[PDB]
């Protein structure tokens, strides 16, 4: 995904369908960030128990 | 895609070259039959050469070179030579002419004619209205 | 003092919160610590975004001719 954005920045502007393919992607990648942050939190407290 | 050289008197095959990747639609040769130029669907113009004296004594052709000059098929090819002219003119589905030199086909320069040269105008504009 | 390189102080603090234990911690002070940590997490996320950013024809057109 990093390459295609770095390689098709201009085609991105002129294509609407590509734009929504990122909008949902940004929402999904954001959701993964929340899970990974959440996983770190359960990881932190699990250390406290032991 | 094959170019074959047949002996006329015996009606037998002398040489076969699997040169093109698709149909060979047109062939042409120079005045002295030192070069044979083939072109077709694969957009390439192949040169077969027998200019060397050793080639002539043995009557063996050599797949000297090829060039990719067209964006589409090459339907027609023709050649002309004189004391002041040396042309290899080709064209096809691209709708444009390409001009090369027969003697210096491998390394010589080439010209791609404009698709439309409006010697006769197909458009007019009216200043009023 | 904390509520008032930093990880080597914070990671040390995380060791404190493990050493102190669940029971010994007090709710009143814990709230202040929670407000502090949530403050740093927001900032740390902000800086991470900045760091990544640093690492990162018409049919008819009207024009004026110069003559």
């Amino acid at each position: 995904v990093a390459v295609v954005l770095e390689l098709y920045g201009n085609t991105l502007e002129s294509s609407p369908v590509l734009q929504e393919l990122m909008i949902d992607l940004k929402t999904k990648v954001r959701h993964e960030i929340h899970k990974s942050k959440e996983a770190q939190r359960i990881e932190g407290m699990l250390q406290l128990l032991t | 895609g094959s170019i074959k050289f047949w002996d006329f008197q015996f009606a037998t095959l002398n040489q076969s070259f699997k040169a093109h990747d698709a149909d060979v639609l047109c062939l042409t040769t120079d005045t002295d039959n030192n070069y044979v130029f083939s072109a077709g669907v694969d957009r390439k113009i192949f040169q077969f050469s027998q200019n060397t004296n050793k080639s002539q004594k043995n009557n063996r052709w050599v797949n000297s070179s090829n060039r990719l000059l067209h964006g589409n098929d090459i339907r027609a090819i023709c050649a002309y030579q004189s004391k002041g002219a040396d042309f290899l003119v080709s064209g096809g589905v691209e709708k444009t002419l390409v001009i090369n030199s027969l003697t210096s086909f491998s390394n010589g320069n080439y010209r791609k004619m404009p698709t439309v040269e409006p010697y006769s105008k197909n458009v007019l504009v009216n200043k009023e209205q | 003092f904390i509520t008032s390189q930093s990880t080597q102080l914070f990671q040390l603090l995380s060791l404190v919160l493990d050493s102190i234990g669940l029971f010994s911690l007090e709710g009143a002070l814990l709230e202040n610590l929670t407000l502090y940590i949530d403050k740093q997490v927001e900032i740390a996320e902000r800086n991470t975004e900045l760091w990544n950013l640093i690492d990162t024809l018409p049919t008819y057109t009207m024009e004026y001719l110069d003559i």
């Binding site: 942050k37 770190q40 939190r41 359960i42 990881e43 932190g44 407290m45 250390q47 406290l48 | - | 390189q5 930093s6 990880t7 914070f10 990671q11 603090l13 995380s14 919160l17 493990d18 669940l22 911690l25 709710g27 814990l30 709230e31 610590l33 929670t34 940590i37 949530d38 403050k39 740093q40 997490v41 900032i43 740390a44 996320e45 902000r46 800086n47 991470t48 975004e49 900045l50 760091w51 950013l53 640093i54 690492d55 990162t56």
Partner: protein, 132 residues
């Protein structure tokens, strides 16, 4: 809004040391920061000055609570990137390394905080459950 923008524009032309104070003015909002960058930062010299001031400030205190200066940096990088790298000043490259070094720490600092945040959250919940 218009007054501060005109003041900031004048200070950039005047090489004033007050450029930083203009940038921290509370009147600034995100949309006009975008408008200022797109409309008024038309010369590379002005762009370099704003980056140098912001980057130097952030380098000194990357943990400053004022989100405005980071907000300037974010949109300045997002909107004007193609020519920020076009700036060939050596000091501009050096200050970029300093800024990256300061922020690079913070990215390393984040995972520890999230763990500390998590262990506290359990403690608050357990205390609440014990109370109930």
């Amino acid at each position: 809004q218009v007054e501060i923008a005109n003041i900031l524009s004048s200070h950039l032309e005047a090489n004033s040391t007050e450029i930083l104070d203009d940038l921290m003015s509370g009147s600034w909002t995100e949309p006009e920061i975008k408008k200022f960058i797109l409309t008024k930062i038309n010369t590379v010299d002005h762009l370099s000055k704003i980056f140098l001031t912001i980057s130097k400030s952030i380098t000194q205190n990357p943990w400053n609570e004022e989100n405005l200066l980071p907000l300037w940096l974010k949109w300045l990088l997002t909107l004007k990137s193609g020519e920020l790298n076009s700036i060939k000043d050596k000091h501009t490259k050096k200050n970029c390394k300093h800024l990256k070094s300061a922020l690079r720490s913070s990215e390393e600092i984040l995972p520890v905080l999230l763990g500390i945040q998590g262990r506290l959250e359990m403690l608050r919940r357990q205390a609440k459950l014990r109370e109930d």
